[PDB]
Scaffold this active site. Structure first.
Site, PDB file in Angstrom:
ATOM      1  CD  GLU A 179      -3.157  -0.584  -0.060  1.00  0.00           C
ATOM      2  OE1 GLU A 179      -3.008   0.471  -0.716  1.00  0.00           O
ATOM      3  OE2 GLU A 179      -4.037  -1.444  -0.356  1.00  0.00           O
ATOM      4  CG  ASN A 225      -8.064   7.190  -5.762  1.00  0.00           C
ATOM      5  OD1 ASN A 225      -7.360   6.319  -6.297  1.00  0.00           O
ATOM      6  ND2 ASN A 225      -8.180   7.313  -4.435  1.00  0.00           N
ATOM      7  CG  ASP A 255     -13.510   7.905  -6.086  1.00  0.00           C
ATOM      8  OD1 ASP A 255     -12.336   8.317  -6.116  1.00  0.00           O
ATOM      9  OD2 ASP A 255     -13.918   7.087  -5.245  1.00  0.00           O
ATOM     10  CB  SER A 265     -11.766   9.436  -2.815  1.00  0.00           C
ATOM     11  OG  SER A 265     -11.253   8.344  -3.569  1.00  0.00           O
ATOM     12  CG  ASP A 317      -6.299   5.628  -1.801  1.00  0.00           C
ATOM     13  OD1 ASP A 317      -7.480   5.487  -1.439  1.00  0.00           O
ATOM     14  OD2 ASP A 317      -5.881   5.308  -2.930  1.00  0.00           O
ATOM     15  CG  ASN A 351     -11.031   6.260  -0.628  1.00  0.00           C
ATOM     16  OD1 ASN A 351     -12.207   6.620  -0.615  1.00  0.00           O
ATOM     17  ND2 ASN A 351     -10.186   6.600  -1.584  1.00  0.00           N
TER      18      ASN A 351
END
Length: 130
Positions: free
Chosen positions: A35, A46, A49, A51, A53, A60
């Site tokens: 990750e 991202n 959408d 958003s 992380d 998220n």
């Protein structure tokens, strides 16, 4: 903060992650490695959408933490996303535990499915004394 392998293994253990909801430390280590490469300030936007992380577990903003700028978002961990960017991972761990309390468990992270599920993950905790 960028953790050294065994340093993170012991840190996670002390935070009660070994066997949490049946998830071994090696699984958490494999997750963190893929990750964020063990980097607590890792971030990934991202565009799709809108958003982001956050942190060592790349949690998220659309569902788990609040950053104010994600459209139609919720905050299941009840934390500012800033809390997921601290060198101290206690808050990120509390949130990661909240995530796996859901049906999917550790499978909530697709990266875990592609890179850790049914893999030999012993190497993540070997020699760490955990």
């Amino acid at each position: 903060k960028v953790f050294e392998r065994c340093e993170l293994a012991r840190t996670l253990k002390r935070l009660g992650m070994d066997g949490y909801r049946g998830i071994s430390l090696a699984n958490w280590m494999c997750l963190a490695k893929w990750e964020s490469g063990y980097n607590t300030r890792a971030t990934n936007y991202n565009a799709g959408d809108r958003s982001t992380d956050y942190g060592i577990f790349q949690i998220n903003s659309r569902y788990w933490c609040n950053d104010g700028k994600t459209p139609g978002a919720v905050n299941a961990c009840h934390l500012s996303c800033s809390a997921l960017l601290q060198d101290n991972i206690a808050d990120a761990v509390a949130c990661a535990k909240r995530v796996v309390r859901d049906p999917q468990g550790i499978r909530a992270w697709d990266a875990w499915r592609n890179r850790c599920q049914n893999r030999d993950v012993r190497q993540y905790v070997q020699g760490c004394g955990v």
